[PDB]
Symmetry: C4
Subunit: 388 residues, 4 copies
């Protein structure tokens, strides 16, 4: 078994095709299924796995009460083959209320963060053993991607933040070899706030589209040089911005360099990726709430400031249904690297108060060079049918 | 691991022997079990798997209500080892309300159709990654086999239809290499309506017996040339016809060439295969309803128009019990290729209205050159014992 | 991987030590667990599996009602790693209300009998595919061992009976190569009724201790020559007899040759094996009912007619608790072949009428050359705590 | 695959980082989960497993009533991958109310004790088969480590005791090769009572920190010479003692040689390990009850009698929460052997009488050379939410 290098060109795509769906919430009404949030997907060279942060409880369980909260000691990282719902046989890979995972071609790396808000611990687990750990550097909720990290030639990279959720924070990029932290680079560039990066291999480096929770509804970009550990950052040029909340399409802006100061505070994890001058991106359909989900290509979305010409739109989840987090993952094909994405379908609180829990299912799409039609693939549970 | 060629003679058989049964519905009354329909079986070179289209819910679950419907966004393709019932640990292989799967000797191919009736998407997943996709070509419920596809020397073929369920439609035959569509041939020959083909290797080609939902209660045949992609089609010669509904045996006809125009509209997925001039086939015992299941050999059933001399009949499910879809699968033996079949045993609506759900179990038989007795292997659930 | 030959001497044992227990019935009161009976154990060269005949239902399930009956179409052979209780993820290996299984060193053979009492079918499944089948030869409940078959040098043998349960029947010994029946030998010798043989490798042949359901409370012996297919039979010499019912120790007899005509009608599956002139055997503690279970060595029990000197007794299940079937299995060690046994612990009807079902758990012991103490390892469920 | 030698230096650590947590009890309130106690962790060269002694029942089950008791015939050793909670698919590895397991690089050894208090049997199972057994030598509850044994170059060692729980007993050290007992050494040295040793490889030998249930609240040490089978023993030098009950830190003592006679009777399984003159250890936070859990390094804790200078303290479980047993396990890294530990989190009786059962979950930490923060990772179940 050899290290992944991801040294193939990016697959040229025409859009995305249905890949997976787990129906977690529908099943929870007739079976013992984990309460989760912050899911993601990552694949070893052979097969794909679905991940999520458990809440230390199943849904039909009095412990499901008040699971809207983000951080408790009982949250653990769950890992199943993609499409296997989180049943009671699911392995809890580590303790985590924030995480990132990736396979370097030989073994799995898991980055798991847990403990006190003001003094958290990140554990680094590789090939099934704890290899390293680091403590909070800013004493304010050390946190990471909530989607896959990326490895090239045996070095995995992950983006981590510690500090204010509504102001300048301390973001660092780690380089990890077989679970051992070998280098840490400070964030550099023009991005002013970085959270929950959705990263992907772009040989010879790694590129990330993240969440600015402070002043931007445009998404920050973090570029990682795997050769000399140097870091650059900016913002996605597209005038059709990807965060939520955000202004409507007719009044949104991005200059590629600065946070737009348009409903900048708060946000949601998301993704986008470049193709030459163009940009493929997803976002919630609603501009103010985590409702609906759409993807499209923005012409000049990567290179041209404030570009707003889109094409190849697809509805993933219609705007009558709840969405949530979304993130990218990459899958190596015979001759090219394909881009896929998942979306978290959040049910329960705070939006749906009939129940006292908060959980999610997922739906997953992959880049295609073929053709496709239309549809909508929401969570599908009837809130009135659920144990409260 | 080498590609399958299926280049062995067909096993000579005297009938069929019991192979598998999952007791899905009986178990659903005391356990969390998926609601399904449209099951099938396919085997890799080592072992067999049972497949089915889930309804995104378990049976003892309020979401089981009104699962009689064929197409919702939450249907996914399930896959377990044969004889492992669809419990909550079952892997959902892809999103699909119509599907076909097959192993080429190296990896699994999955053809998964989902989305809007008028604009569906078929995803092609090979070796655990999405490789290709195609959109609806006639904007009227793109649909496929609901049983195993067939691969020879690295090329897998599958039959798909788009268009009217009760009139001329657009049927195409796809040739797929490692998940990539390399050629598409239009249907040719005298078959006038093609649905839900049950295909099997007949080296050097592939042969399919299908469902004519328009004018024929005789089953159409599709012959696929894997070498030059040419297509031929006709109808099973046997005067004992295999569709449901159909005329009684004394007034049924087939001329090998045209739909018989006898209770031709509607139908059910089924199978048959040739042995020289003779035909082995199954069908429901009832001529108008999906009740009972019987197999027999028709002497001259392949070569002689309107032949009605049968022998070696076996009851699989007696006519007091519900059946449903049936399909063929092929298993490679030491010196010959054996033919097997499964029978879908539908319970619930529309026939059984005490409950509000629709689901199924399966029973499976394989060709034998030995001897055997008699029996009946129905679903076995007591509708009165079921959660409604 | 090479065929098993079992060409090592039998391990010299001092008695038996605890090996496994599944607690099936206790768990059934708080979890979804298969209803079973007629369990056994068999191991591949690496590890051991527990088998049983399911009743097509879990215990906490209205379908568990009236499962005291021996034969329905929904019974299937279940197979898990030893110690894994029959949960809903259990694989149903074949359709069977009577069975036998064994591994020849390369793959698993399953002999599965189902269908009508008067016209049953035995299916032979090898390496995951149906290879052969035979129909009933006496039209009266074709039946087999309910414990492991035995393979030497690629040839597996199994004992089958068809005909009266209370009079002369038609017993045959099959020889099977990779699932294919290659020879069938009639029973020969002085055994007058043969059922449910517990067989073991005794290189170069196979030896079986069985159940005479007609005239003997002494257990029949069947000796199988794997070289020329010849068959011999007799009765265990020991004056301490192994069947239930039987006379008490002071009035029981065996002459090694004929059924003793002592409470000979009815019986229970059991086991014993020879060591030189001596015999190791198990039996129920009660002489009339399937209660308790004990093992001991009879001095001269193999060679001396009516020998009644025992030593090294061990209580496996005390006489205040229900037992049932028991059988032998053999495990290859570094330098010798060890003998182990399981016992079926039957709960429910007909003995316990508070519940309407019949099921079992198991306890398993293996031969030891070391030392050991005392105990009792019954089912352990409180009948009053059970779903009825 | 080669035998383990553990011939690498001990990893230098700065403390411990979060590794695993199973949330057993929270899950038991909404799912079918085994009732357990006496858990531990052990890893093969690739991955880690969690073990525990089942009570032959799930928690939401009437059989969970009165499971506070230590020894019943239905207790079996459970084994899952670490982080997989004990669901119904869990393998019961052997019958046991006391156990120890370890992997020698090639296969698993299991030491399983069950049967009558006065006449127990220890079974030795290696590579999936029973290889040896030994009977009770003092007729008073033969018992062992309840944590991993240790193997070097194909020889595994385990510590066992038989005799008084509150007086002089008979402790022996077994050396086992491929499941076969090759030598037994009597305890020697100054330790006066030995139970439940937590052992670890310290090449070329093995070192154990145990429980003195008679006169010491200081923990006994047992040193095992794997080359000549010689045994030495003493007591942990640290004046900060590790047993419960114990004197408070101001009035506790140890002289490295003798039991301290400070609240010496009773106790709890625990651990510690040396690093030069220093000691890393864990213990309950409460000095009289199994509540809370803390780790720290004692400067001179290994070499200096009565040393009480600690540093690098970490709270694992705060003193408002129940703990229980704890034990060490060792994990081979690229260049060093790391030390890890688990903590048993006991819920139910006798401390919490709303419920009638006794069970536990686990939390697991591994040594780190990196940095870390603070937290508390208790069981987390709400006793009021539990089935009683
Ligand atoms: C069957 O399915 C196919 C494939 O999904 C589908 O074709 C697609 O239609 C959409 C919508 O027309 C196309 O995407 C659009 O492209 C135009 C540029 O040509 C953009 O201007 C559009 O964006 C505007 O309109 C959107 C609403 O449609 C707004 O949300 C957005 O803010 C803009 O105002 C949009 O991106 C897409 O390019 C094609 N795909 C392909 C490959 O042709 C087809 O319509 C379906 N057929 C039917 C009748 O259902
Ligand atoms: C024990 O089991 C064996 C094996 O199943 C069984 O033998 C089989 O009997 C059936 C029924 O007689 C045979 O099948 C028939 O073959 C004749 C030609 O010889 C056909 O004419 C029959 O078809 C007509 O009758 C059917 C009803 O039986 C109608 O449904 C049909 O429309 C036709 O009118 C039928 O195909 C079969 O050939 C044998 N199998 C073998 C290998 O011998 C035997 O009867 C069983 N014994 C008992 C008493 O259960
Ligand atoms: C601790 O455990 C050991 C191992 O189990 C145990 O030693 C065993 O005791 C039994 C009972 O005494 C021995 O078996 C007996 O052997 C004598 C011949 O020496 C037979 O006569 C006995 O059979 C008669 O008695 C039985 C009841 O005990 C009747 O059921 C039977 O019908 C006969 O009347 C019986 O087989 C056995 O040999 C030893 N095992 C060894 C290896 O020594 C020991 O007793 C236990 N200690 C205590 C005090 O519990
Ligand atoms: C963020 O996390 C870090 C890492 O956990 C943490 O630093 C640690 O603080 C503890 C507590 O001060 C240190 O442990 C102490 O070490 C001193 C010697 O230097 C000992 O005297 C202490 O023992 C006494 O006090 C204990 C209570 O704190 C008593 O229980 C005990 O009986 C003694 O009286 C204790 O061992 C530890 O060394 C550091 N760790 C490192 C690596 O620096 C830090 O405090 C956290 N920050 C916050 C604000 O949460
Ligand atoms: C399954 O769903 C159906 C449809 O909603 C339910 O039946 C309906 O119940 C409503 C409310 O009482 C009635 O007003 C309608 O007349 C019913 N519809 C039909 C078509 O009969 C039914 O209750 C559900 N089944 C279960 C078991 O909950
Ligand atoms: C198991 O099945 C039997 C047979 O139906 C049930 O016993 C019968 O119950 C009916 C209706 O409740 C009574 O009228 C009959 O008197 C019973 N028949 C017999 C033979 O006693 C029994 O109730 C079922 N058990 C459970 C728990 O459902
Ligand atoms: C657990 O078992 C105990 C003991 O049987 C039960 O408590 C007893 O109940 C009986 C009958 O009601 C009383 O007479 C005794 O006084 C009780 N014993 C004790 C020690 O209190 C208890 O009910 C069981 N728990 C549950 C939830 O079923
Ligand atoms: C570590 C932590 O709690 N991270 C958060 C996160 C966070 O609050 C913001 O991004 C602000 O910094 O946002 C939210 C959110 O849904 O917006 C979920 C996360 N939940 C978990 N990761 N557990
Ligand atoms: C795609 C789809 O909905 N196909 C159908 C199918 C169909 O309606 C006819 O064949 C007419 O074209 O028939 C039936 C049927 O039970 O008759 C089940 C199917 N259900 C599913 N495949 N889900
Ligand atoms: C095939 C069949 O029904 N065999 C029987 C069996 C049998 O009735 C006698 O041995 C008489 O011939 O006995 C019993 C019994 O417990 O005695 C269980 C079996 N149950 C099952 N094997 N399913
Ligand atoms: C074999 C046995 O029953 N051992 C004990 C044990 C024991 O009583 C003492 O150490 C004194 O000898 O302590 C306790 C304990 O929680 O204190 C748990 C054990 N339970 C089990 N191992 N099952
Ligand atoms: C959840 O907890 C809240 C706050 O304690 C309580 O008011 C509510 O009743 C709980 N919900 C359920 C379903 O028990
Ligand atoms: Ca924002
Ligand atoms: Ca038709
Ligand atoms: Ca008898
Ligand atoms: Ca003590």
């Amino acid at each position: 078994v050899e290290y992944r290098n991801w040294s193939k060109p990016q697959c040229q795509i025409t859009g995305f095709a249905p890949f997976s769906k787990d129906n977690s919430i529908r099943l929870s009404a007739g079976g013992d299924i984990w309460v989760t949030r912050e899911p993601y997907v990552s694949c070893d060279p052979g097969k794909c796995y679905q991940f999520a942060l458990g809440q230390g409880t199943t849904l039909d369980n009095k412990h499901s009460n008040d699971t809207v909260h983000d951080r408790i000691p009982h949250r653990t990282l769950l890992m199943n083959e993609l499409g296997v719902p989180f049943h009671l046989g699911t392995r809890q890979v580590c303790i985590a209320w924030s995480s990132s995972s990736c396979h370097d071609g030989k073994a799995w790396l898991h980055v798991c963060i847990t403990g006190d808000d003001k003094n958290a611990t990140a554990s680094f687990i590789y090939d099934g053993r704890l290899v390293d750990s680091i403590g909070s550097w800013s004493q304010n909720i050390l946190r990471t991607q909530e989607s896959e990290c990326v490895c090239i030639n045996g070095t995995c990279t992950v983006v981590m933040t510690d500090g204010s959720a509504s102001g300048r924070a301390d973001t660092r990029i780690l380089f990890i070899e077989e679970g051992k932290i070998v280098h840490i680079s400070p964030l550099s560039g023009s991005a002013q706030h970085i959270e929950e990066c959705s990263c992907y291999p772009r040989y010879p480096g790694v590129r990330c589209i993240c969440r600015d929770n402070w002043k931007g509804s445009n998404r920050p970009v973090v570029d990682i040089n795997m050769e000399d550990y140097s870091i650059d950052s900016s913002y996605v040029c597209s005038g059709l911005v990807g965060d939520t909340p955000r202004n409507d399409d007719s009044s949104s802006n991005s200059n590629c360099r600065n946070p737009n100061n348009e409903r900048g505070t708060q946000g949601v994890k998301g993704w986008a990726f470049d193709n030459g001058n163009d940009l493929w991106m997803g976002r919630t359909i609603s501009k103010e709430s985590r409702s609906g989900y759409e993807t499209f290509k923005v012409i000049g979305g990567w290179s041209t400031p404030n570009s707003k010409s889109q094409v190849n739109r697809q509805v993933i989840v219609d705007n009558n249904n709840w969405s949530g987090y979304s993130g990218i993952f990459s899958v190596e094909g015979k001759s090219c690297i394909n881009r896929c994405f998942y979306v978290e379908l959040i049910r329960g609180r705070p939006q749906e108060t009939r129940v006292w829990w908060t959980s999610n299912s997922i739906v997953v799409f992959c880049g295609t060079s073929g053709t496709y039609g239309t549809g909508s693939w929401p969570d599908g549970a009837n809130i009135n049918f659920m144990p409260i």
